[PDB]
Amino acid sequence: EDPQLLVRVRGGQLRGIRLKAPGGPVSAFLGIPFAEPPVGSRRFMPPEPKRPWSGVLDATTFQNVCYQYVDTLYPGFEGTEMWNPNRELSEDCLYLNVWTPYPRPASPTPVLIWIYGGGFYSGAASLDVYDGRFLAQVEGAVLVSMNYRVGTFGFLALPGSREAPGNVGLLDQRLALQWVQENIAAFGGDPMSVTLFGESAGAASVGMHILSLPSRSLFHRAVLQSGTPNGPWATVSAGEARRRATLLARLVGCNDTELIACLRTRPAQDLVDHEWHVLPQESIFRFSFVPVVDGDFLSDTPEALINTGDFQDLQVLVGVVKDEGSYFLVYGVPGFSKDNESLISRAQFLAGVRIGVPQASDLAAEAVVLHYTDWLHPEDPTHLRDAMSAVVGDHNVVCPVAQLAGRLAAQGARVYAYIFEHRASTLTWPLWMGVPHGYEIEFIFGLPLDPSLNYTTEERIFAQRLMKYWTNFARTGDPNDPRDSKSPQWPPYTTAAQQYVSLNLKPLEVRRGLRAQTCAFWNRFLPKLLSAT
Amino acid sequence: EGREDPQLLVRVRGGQLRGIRLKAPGGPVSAFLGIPFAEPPVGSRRFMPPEPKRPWSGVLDATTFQNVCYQYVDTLYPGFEGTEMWNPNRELSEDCLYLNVWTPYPRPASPTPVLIWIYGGGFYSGAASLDVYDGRFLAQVEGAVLVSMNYRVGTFGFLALPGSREAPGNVGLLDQRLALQWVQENIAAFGGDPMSVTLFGESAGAASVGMHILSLPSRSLFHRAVLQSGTPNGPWATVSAGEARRRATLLARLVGCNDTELIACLRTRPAQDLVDHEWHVLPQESIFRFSFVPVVDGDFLSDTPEALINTGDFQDLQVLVGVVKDEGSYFLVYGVPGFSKDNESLISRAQFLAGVRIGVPQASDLAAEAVVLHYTDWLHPEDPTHLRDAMSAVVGDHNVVCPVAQLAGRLAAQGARVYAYIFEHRASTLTWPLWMGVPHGYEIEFIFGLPLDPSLNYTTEERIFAQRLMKYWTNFARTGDPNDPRDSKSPQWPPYTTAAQQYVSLNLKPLEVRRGLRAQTCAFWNRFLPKLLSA
């Protein structure tokens, strides 16, 4: 009976488990409930705080994954399976996990809260790549991660209605944040030093907590990895949210009250089965149910809020991987596949752009094609394929990120920017995809320190650097070592110098302008093109 | 006769000529200057097509340059070499349709290739008698026969009331053609080969050449062509009949004037009256825009140049084309606020936006912003030096480089053999400020070989450079290949193809082959922006 593995939170007692990490043991408390199960009548509803419990609750295993669509494009393929649920699915899923060093921290410790991604339709805190044992052991951090409702269960909304107000998936996150404030001190964590970090839909979520005032009192620093609250995919309007909900209802056999009633009486899979068939266009990087501009959680559009927000005492770390768009091409764009080199014609390229940019008018689409064409080699299938990836990557991530970083820096925020350019030696996706969306994560969480995963010895050294950057940023709001000299230093991103760094096997290198001319095209011109048409 | 130089006496279809023996650095040449090739386009013949010169009696003196065609004269920088060198160096008059001939002294044994120069000047100015068009160097050093003609400019050359009898338009181009016909009939008398005639010209002259390529009756008067910093396609080289009709009618009103009655009244006006008003009819505040230019009349030009270059067959055509490095800089000091030759012309972003509207006068607010955003340096969007050099590039790319790029592209794709160059050497003798780099028209003095004249204070390297280019141009006229067959040691100048898009740098250093002429940027101007003005 290890007293290190025993903790009293406000809801009662927990029994953690001692886990072996390469450099030593860590105390893990997995599967802690922070909310009443959002089941039956609580479907589509805001989460309620967990009722106290008797005795000692067993917090030694990962709990269920929020009911969600499971990918099927490449059954058995490791590259896809690493993102699929690794526990049983259930609407009863609102549990969070906690890692601390072993022994428990003597002094109050910085808290890292991970918010996973998955297009707001998938994901789980129990995936191996989110294993928080390495950060807790090496950097002496307290890591926290929560499940939150995805898909219809988390973001289906009939705006203005009482029984489906929307954004409950975000409120799931917010409640887990409140839990950390109220309870993390018992784990040796410092609630006055909470750093949110997430990836993809997770990064966008972190961003929405930045833009929602009630959330702001629950953290001190933020990290957005390859995702933003602004951009074409992270949010929908109230009108469009109301449209998709009513269509899904129709697709399953269903006054707002009475319509949501019928949906509550439907097996979880019946909703998921029709989840993807409510999208207005054929598209990639588009997600049926996502956060909504409701005037509540989001008082206005993210664009509006980032444009007029005071970010005076905020510190943020943002970045992208080298190939943000490649992953999405094999999931809808004809000509692409993980199994060949996906060399495409110029014709396929024009077609894919209508899919990568479902919003674009004919003129706007052609403007994209003409901008991304290599007029020295306009027919070269390699360039066209690599260009199709860039259109998607830049439209959906890089330039949304560049825009956000610009607005934040300009309006008083402290900003550090990176680009991640190392491809894992263990990667199973083809070489033409390069460094796909999501594959910085395993390095930040320090999995290469696990010798069994067959990572190269250089990657282990690389992973330790990144863990240092992230945790130094968590401790201080500055990823730079307060002990290291020549390197050189990671400088703040500013609207003037626009400096960012490259994260790879080679030392930090400072560059300037994050695809500036291309993002000028996406962020300044094309909007004018659909604001006149 | 009796005591004249027997090499300086020559007969042509219209009578006898007395040429003059001229000194060049390397020896003598024969010059026959001021040869009339048309009846004076005066009185009732104003705005009318040229009638061939009626034969004369006796020996016409052909030893000095004749009158310069009536035209506006630059007054922006009085007493400044940079402007004076382009200004008329003879008397202005409507009686101006004469041409000039240089030949080796003595005239050559076998018939020699003929070069015909067509001067530029925005179709509103120019003269074949300018020092920079001196054909004595090409004749002496390369053994070439060099011809240059005066052609009517401004209203006298291009004012059109399309469909009318008394003002059909393009008469300025018909002057050029008549001179080409004159060469076909008479140049043999000078030892020139009428079967090997190469046209070459700059700016509005290069455009003119392109028009002769695209006009059938002219195609039988030459065999090869060179276009320097100009094209018949593009925004300034032509106008619609409707537009020409409007500009003509407006000018009439501005001086106090049924097409017949209107033209008749214009013919009663002093020549200076017309010049004093021709600039006041431009639809906008603009640079690199000229009031009276070739019109698409459906006659000389059966259709728009863009149309004809896109559909025409050019298999049997060989053409040499190119640009200078800073095509647009010259034009900024002539109407973009913030620019001058006497300061560094560092401008603000606001002035850049304003300049774009003047340099792209036919653009919407959207089109204009697209230009600005395309040409902005987003790492330094406020940097005045980058904004200044961007304004030059916008004007340069829109008016010359991308029209030339389009032209080379279409011609190569449709059978033509195309050679492409960029000229990057700034004359050490240049009096324009350094920020202008290599401006519009300052390759010419090197092509004509002026550096070979020791009294002009060029560097020795420039003298070798000039000789090298004279070889390129004359080799091309001689063979349809600027390369020297004898010399394979030197780097070759490859034809421009759609595939490789090869072209050469022309400077003090040896030939360097590059690929794509503003490929990305010209995709913007030639593919995107047109389809933006389709909305």
Ligand SMILES: CCN1CCN(C2CCN(C(=O)COc3ccc(-c4ccccc4)cc3)CC2)CC1
């Ligand atoms: C956290 C990092 N993650 C996020 C994204 N990554 C992949 C997974 C799936 N993606 C899609 O766009 C799904 O598209 C579709 C489209 C259609 C259907 C479908 C639905 C019903 C019937 C048939 C097909 C399913 C998925 C993006 C790329 C994996 C790693």
Ligand SMILES: CCN1CCN(C2CCN(C(=O)COc3ccc(-c4ccccc4)cc3)CC2)CC1
């Ligand atoms: C053969 C190579 N050439 C071609 C062009 N080069 C210069 C000369 C003048 N340019 C103009 O656009 C004139 O503009 C204007 C605008 C307005 C007025 C004006 C008219 C009436 C009253 C006041 C001003 C005059 C000229 C272009 C750049 C010189 C060498």
